[PDB]
């Protein structure tokens, strides 16, 4: 389900951010790739410097491939 996935997204943010309010950019790349999300270079360059859980949840709901 989508709710199932949102809980997976949340727990993964906690893991990849080491329990922090903001995730380092290179760890954000690891986090998104762990869910199959591949950004283009200039999409990466457009990410804001400060990435919190709500940013990641909105991002993951937009980019995740629910077919796979």
Author numbering: 1 to 68
Quote the study that presented this structure, word for word:
Proliferation and transmission of these obligate endoparasites in their host organisms rely on efficient cell invasion. This active process is based on the motility of the parasite, referred to as gliding, and is empowered by an actin/myosin motor. Actin polymerization occurs between the plasma membrane (PM) and the inner membrane complex (IMC) whereas myosin A is part of the glideosome, which binds the essential light chains ELC and myosin light chain MLC1 (called myosin tail interacting protein, MTIP, in Plasmodium spp.). MLC1 (in P. falciparum: myosin A tail-interacting protein, MTIP) binds at the very C-terminus of MyoA, while ELC is expected to interact with the C-terminus of MyoA upstream of MLC115. We demonstrate that ELCs bind to a conserved binding site on MyoA to induce its α-helical secondary structure and stiffen the MyoA neck.
Heteronuclear NOEs ({1H}-15N NOE) and chemical shift analysis revealed that the protein consists of an α-helical N-terminal domain, while the C-terminal part is disordered. Based on this finding, we were able to determine the structure of the N-terminal PfELC fragment (amino acids 1–74, PfELC-N) by both X-ray crystallography to 1.5 Å resolution and by NMR spectroscopy. The N-terminal domain of PfELC has a typical calmodulin fold with two EF-hands formed by two helix-loop-helix motifs. Both EF-hands lack the canonical residues that usually bind calcium in calmodulins28 and in agreement with that, we did not observe any electron density corresponding to a bound ion. PfELC-N crystallized as a dimer covalently linked via disulfide bridge, but both NMR and non-reducing SDS-PAGE indicate that the protein exists as a monomer in solution and the scattering data calculated from a protein monomer structure fit the measured X-ray scattering profile with Χ2 = 1.37. A comparison between the crystal and the NMR structure highlights that the loop of the first EF hand (residues 16–22) and the third helix (residues 40–47) display the highest degree of flexibility, in agreement with the heteronuclear NOE experiment. The lowest energy NMR conformers are very similar to the crystal structure, with an average backbone RMSD of 1.4 Å over residues 1–68. In general, the assigned backbone resonances in the NMR spectra superimpose for both full-length protein PfELC and the N-terminal domain, proving that the N-terminal domain maintains the same structure as in the full-length context. Contrary to T. gondii TgELCs, the homologous EF hand loop of PfELC (in isolation or in complex) is bent to the other side and does not possess the residues needed for coordination of calcium.
